[PDB]
Amino acid sequence: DAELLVTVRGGRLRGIRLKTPGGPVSAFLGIPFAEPPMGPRRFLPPEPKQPWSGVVDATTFQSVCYQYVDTLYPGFEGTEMWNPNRELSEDCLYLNVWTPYPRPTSPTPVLVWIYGGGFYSGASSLDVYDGRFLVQAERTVLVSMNYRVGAFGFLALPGSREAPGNVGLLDQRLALQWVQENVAAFGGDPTSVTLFGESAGAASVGMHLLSPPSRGLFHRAVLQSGAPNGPWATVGMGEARRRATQLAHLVGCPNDTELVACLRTRPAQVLVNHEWHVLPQESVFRFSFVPVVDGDFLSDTPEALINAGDFHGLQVLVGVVKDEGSYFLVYGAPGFSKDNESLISRAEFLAGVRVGVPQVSDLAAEAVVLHYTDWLHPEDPARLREALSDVVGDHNVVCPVAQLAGRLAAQGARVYAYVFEHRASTLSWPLWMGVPHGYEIEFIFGIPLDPSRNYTAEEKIFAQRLMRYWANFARTGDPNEPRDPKAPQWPPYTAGAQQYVSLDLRPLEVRRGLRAQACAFWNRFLPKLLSAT
Amino acid sequence: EDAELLVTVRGGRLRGIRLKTPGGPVSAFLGIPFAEPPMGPRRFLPPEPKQPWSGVVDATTFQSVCYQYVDTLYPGFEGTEMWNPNRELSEDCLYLNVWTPYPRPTSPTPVLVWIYGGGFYSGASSLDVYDGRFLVQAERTVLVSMNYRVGAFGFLALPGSREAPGNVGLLDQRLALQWVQENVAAFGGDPTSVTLFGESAGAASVGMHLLSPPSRGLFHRAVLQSGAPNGPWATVGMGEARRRATQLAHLVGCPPGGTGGNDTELVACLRTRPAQVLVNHEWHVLPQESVFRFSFVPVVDGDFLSDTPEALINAGDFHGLQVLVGVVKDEGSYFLVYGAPGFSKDNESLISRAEFLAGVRVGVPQVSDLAAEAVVLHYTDWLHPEDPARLREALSDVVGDHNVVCPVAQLAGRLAAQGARVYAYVFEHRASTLSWPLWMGVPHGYEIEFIFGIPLDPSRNYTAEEKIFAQRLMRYWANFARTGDPNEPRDPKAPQWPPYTAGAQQYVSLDLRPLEVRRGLRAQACAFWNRFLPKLLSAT
Ligand SMILES: O=C(/C=C/C=C/c1ccc2c(c1)OCO2)NCCCCCC[PH](c1ccccc1)(c1ccccc1)c1ccccc1
Ligand SMILES: *[C@@H]1O[C@H](CO[C@@H]2O[C@@H](C)[C@@H](O)[C@@H](O)[C@@H]2O)[C@@H](O[C@@H]2O[C@H](CO)[C@@H](O)[C@H](O)[C@H]2NC(C)=O)[C@H](O)[C@H]1NC(C)=O
Ligand SMILES: *[C@@H]1O[C@H](CO[C@@H]2O[C@@H](C)[C@@H](O)[C@@H](O)[C@@H]2O)[C@@H](O[C@@H]2O[C@H](CO)[C@@H](O)[C@H](O)[C@H]2NC(C)=O)[C@H](O)[C@H]1NC(C)=O
Ligand SMILES: *[C@@H]1O[C@H](CO)[C@@H](O)[C@H](O[C@@H]2O[C@H](CO)[C@@H](O)[C@H](O)[C@H]2NC(C)=O)[C@H]1NC(C)=O
Ligand SMILES: *[C@@H]1O[C@H](CO)[C@@H](O)[C@H](O)[C@H]1NC(C)=O
Ligand SMILES: [Br-]
Ligand SMILES: [Br-]
Ligand SMILES: [Cl-]
Ligand SMILES: [Cl-]
Ligand SMILES: [Cl-]
Ligand SMILES: [Cl-]
Ligand SMILES: [Cl-]
Ligand SMILES: [Cl-]
Ligand SMILES: [Cl-]
Ligand SMILES: [Cl-]
Ligand SMILES: [Cl-]
Ligand SMILES: [Cl-]
Ligand SMILES: [Cl-]
Ligand SMILES: [Cl-]
Ligand SMILES: [Cl-]
Ligand SMILES: [Cl-]
Ligand SMILES: [Cl-]
Ligand SMILES: [Cl-]
Ligand SMILES: [Cl-]
Ligand SMILES: [Cl-]
Ligand SMILES: [Cl-]
Ligand SMILES: [Cl-]
Ligand SMILES: [Cl-]
Ligand SMILES: [Cl-]
Ligand SMILES: [Cl-]
């Protein structure tokens, strides 16, 4: 029919009709938004895709940007769900739009999704990011895009013109510039676009909020289990150059301008293979090529930009899962596996602190064990397991997002905070991991509504409730419904009251304090300790 | 009216008094000279044994109180007047007292020795709440208490000097212990089973006695109530002791130095100044403005204390030792009204955060800025950082934990880990007669009333449940003195009081409710004070 042919500023498109229980929606998958960043364009800021003859086959997802794939638990759904589900390519700068089947007559608010995965992995084509349920249930249009990861997106020789850094973030900004120009052609309202992303995606949303040349491209922001001020999300210029030159040394690449020309000669698969070998210490929740504080894009460290900014006119929805740290322990913590119950020794715990909190002093590590061991049960392996799970999750996600939330609200933002604490009935991961990092996404996207997946019916109502909260936020800057006071109110997070809500099968329960007592240590005391020792 | 009231000790004849309790009478010998008066040239000098006397000594009334500051904070208030000296002040104060049961026991009976508290600057055995008669009547033990020099009179030191060597208040105590070694037999007491018990500075001194070998031959069991020798307030270094002493001499105008030595001339000038002028400038030698700090305390001099108590604790001779230790529930509250901004017994002391942050700087005086921030981290409720009610209770914890709770918790674990049999309690019943306000809970010093059986005095308006409580407590203590074990020799149903161990850390709760066995003596808080905080101070 004619609903599946739309033409944007660069050429004609041919979409696909997707089927949901609630009805059909129309999808345009794999839209080129940049000239392929190959050869001399590798490590370079993206260039806008020039117009094309003919019609683009936009019926299936395009390729995945080159990334390391996870072989810890081969064939296991818990890890394979996040692995690439299409061919790897450096020709990967494509985006996707979902829109309702009766194409909207009125301008509709748009959600744009930025996938996570520690700036080294991820793809928009993942099944857990399927847009159809969100646009069919709540009648918004949804855009997602691929951005370069690993060294291809975030290797930097700071100061150089040929490896400037943050081109994966510039990939994102370019796609946002694309929706301003082209989301109108699909029923989307350029004047109400909401960014939402999880993990490294959430941090990417944060950095767009701190980068003036992009803050004009969106109006609301959702940060799921991530913040740009996290200890893992940025590196200094000196460390970025230190990591880039050692990668070149590892692939036999003997100044800056010759260093980068050499790297463009290596096949992309050769760079990927040496990615994790450049890290300065053996560590958990650390990644080799992430955004760099260079003055371009990030005028200052994200913590500074957060501290002295004005956020009036901004609504932000942020939150964490209940067990942020558990997922990461099985990726390098001594004594941890998905297959046993991971009851660690005190010696394994004490060693786990040094790898969970890498590159801090001996005194700092003692401070961590002082705050996290139970001195009536210093040896109980279950308590040490839960303890190290907290250490990693708090230091890396909750305390970074709690710090961002307190300062945004205190400086003019309207902030709503959640803790997602429902364990999916479908969870392949063991039960000691609780609600792991990344396992709200399924519900936010309404995946329980897929008949092929056997989620319970109470779970399907949960996702419909959740995707309404999100849509509601995107439309209004408020998850609650305006003509519905009887429904339990989601109060704004504020620096003093620190109110958040709980997302599980029970109605909205309002709790106060986002692990306040622990994040006082990470956000307040610990920097003072490091600065004076 | 009998012959039980005429006893002869190694130095002469004594004349006692019959004392009255409801349950019966006891015979008491008060004001027994155990040392030659430390006057004139004897000021600041180690005590000398009382020379023997012709005739009979009148041992019928309490002797004098050692010269000390009197508390002028709340005149006429029972809460503060309770501890104030209730006899004439004099430097002639080295006298002791003995209580013994009527018909003095046929058998050798164990003896309890009491050492009073008051931060080494105050206190006397003459206080009403230290009246021995009730428990010596109730439990058939003999009880001894003694006066020791306090303030500069007991603990001024120029380390190395012959004329002010320090710890002479402790040497006063040691002299009294060897006195019972020679003479408690004359009263029915067994020199070979004597138990020391004391509160705060008393508790610290009994603790210090078991770390000084020449005192371990003088007792066999030890009770430490709300005090420990390793407390941050209980000892000073030689350098700080000389610094605090010389500054007192300058404050009362002692320049001269014509011949001899600088040290010996400095003290001779101090010997000439009246006692009350020294008392008046006592609190001015403190290095910073503080609560729970006292200027003249024992010094680590190499003699009495060969090393710091925390050192001496670690490598001690403690196997075969029974020790009973505990704290009240609100240790810090009493001390806040003596310098913490925003606090009064008459106010509800709802403090601001700005006042709290200033209060940690005075409760925890001797430390760096980074250390002080660490204290605010663990004790602030970051969900209600401004709530004045929580800030009030919070600062109470900082002072209570830092000064008594964590020091006795540290001493109890290390005694247990080296072979001692340690029993631990938490006293958490609030006397109905409480003079102090309600926010102070059970303050520092208000278990003493019950331990001594003051609820049984008809003059006082204690409740009926309180008098049975005191009888139970007086039994716990007596049992320990007799056996090294407070609970019943083989009670079938009364809940057993387990020994405190370094791993299980079991203690009991002392209130009208039966023995509650709890685990962990503020374990999570004292990890900061006993373990993390010293590393931080040594590393900044
Ligand atoms: O803690 C981490 C990071 C983990 C998370 C990834 C993730 C997953 C799903 C997500 C997501 C993020 O956000 C949204 O959803 N740690 C690194 C582990 C990542 C995978 C393999 C790397 P590691 C290695 C190298 C250097 C330092 C530390 C770790 C490895 C180590 C121990 C056990 C298993 C794997 C490796 C690299 C190259 C060859 C062999 C092994
Ligand atoms: C929990 O399991 C981990 C890993 O156990 C096994 O790893 C494979 C070798 C295989 O046997 C799987 O069935 C298990 O998952 C234990 O930690 C490992 O211990 C082995 C020694 O047996 C050592 O060689 C590895 O390096 C260890 N791995 C790590 C990451 O430390 C751990 O001890 C188990 N917990 C227990 C037993 O309480
Ligand atoms: C709580 O009380 C203290 C002092 O207790 C007394 O309370 C009053 C009835 C008044 O008569 C005071 O003079 C008493 O000492 C208060 O602390 C002092 O407050 C005054 C008033 O401005 C001030 O000048 C002093 O510096 C304060 N003392 C300090 C800071 O050490 C305190 O303010 C009272 N809190 C209240 C009433 O909320
Ligand atoms: C880096 O290394 C050498 C000199 O240190 C030099 O090759 C690079 O720039 C060169 O500039 C020359 C000017 O025309 C010319 O030889 C060529 O453009 C280029 N060389 C190349 C690409 O191999 C140096 N680059 C810097 C200093 O930025
Ligand atoms: C549940 O769904 C899985 C795939 O997600 C499928 O393999 C399985 O057969 C389903 N359950 C049943 C009982 O059929
Ligand atoms: Br244990
Ligand atoms: Br012994
Ligand atoms: Cl054409
Ligand atoms: Cl499996
Ligand atoms: Cl419409
Ligand atoms: Cl740009
Ligand atoms: Cl930062
Ligand atoms: Cl600031
Ligand atoms: Cl170090
Ligand atoms: Cl247990
Ligand atoms: Cl507002
Ligand atoms: Cl399981
Ligand atoms: Cl709550
Ligand atoms: Cl005489
Ligand atoms: Cl005679
Ligand atoms: Cl008898
Ligand atoms: Cl005292
Ligand atoms: Cl000296
Ligand atoms: Cl000094
Ligand atoms: Cl307590
Ligand atoms: Cl508050
Ligand atoms: Cl409240
Ligand atoms: Cl509470
Ligand atoms: Cl009152
Ligand atoms: Cl505690």
Residue numbers in the entry:
A (entry chain A): 5 to 258, 265 to 543
B (entry chain B): 4 to 543
Give sentences copied directly from the paper behind this entry.
Based on these observations, enzymes involved in neurotransmitters breakdown (e.g., cholinesterases (ChEs); monoamine oxidases (MAOs)) are among the main biological targets for the development of new therapeutics. We then evaluated the compounds’ inhibition profile and binding mode towards cholinesterases (acetylcholinesterase (AChE, EC 3.1.1.7) and butyrylcholinesterase (BChE, EC 3.1.1.8)) and MAOs (MAO-A and MAO-B, EC 1.4.3.4), as well as their antioxidant and redox properties. Compounds 2–5 bind similarly to hAChE and compounds 3 and 5 bind similarly to hBChE, although distinct binding modes of compounds to hAChE and hBChE were observed.
For hAChE, the electron density map corresponding to compound 3 can be observed in the active site of the enzyme, identifying clearly the location of TPP+ moiety at the entrance of the active-site gorge of the enzyme (bottom left). Indeed, compound 3 was the most potent hAChE inhibitor of the series (compound 3: hAChE = 2 µM), while compound 2 presented the lowest IC50 towards hBChE (compound 2: hAChE = 200 nM). While the TPP+ moiety was present at the entrance of the active-site gorge of hAChE, in hBChE it was located within the gorge in the vicinity of the active site.
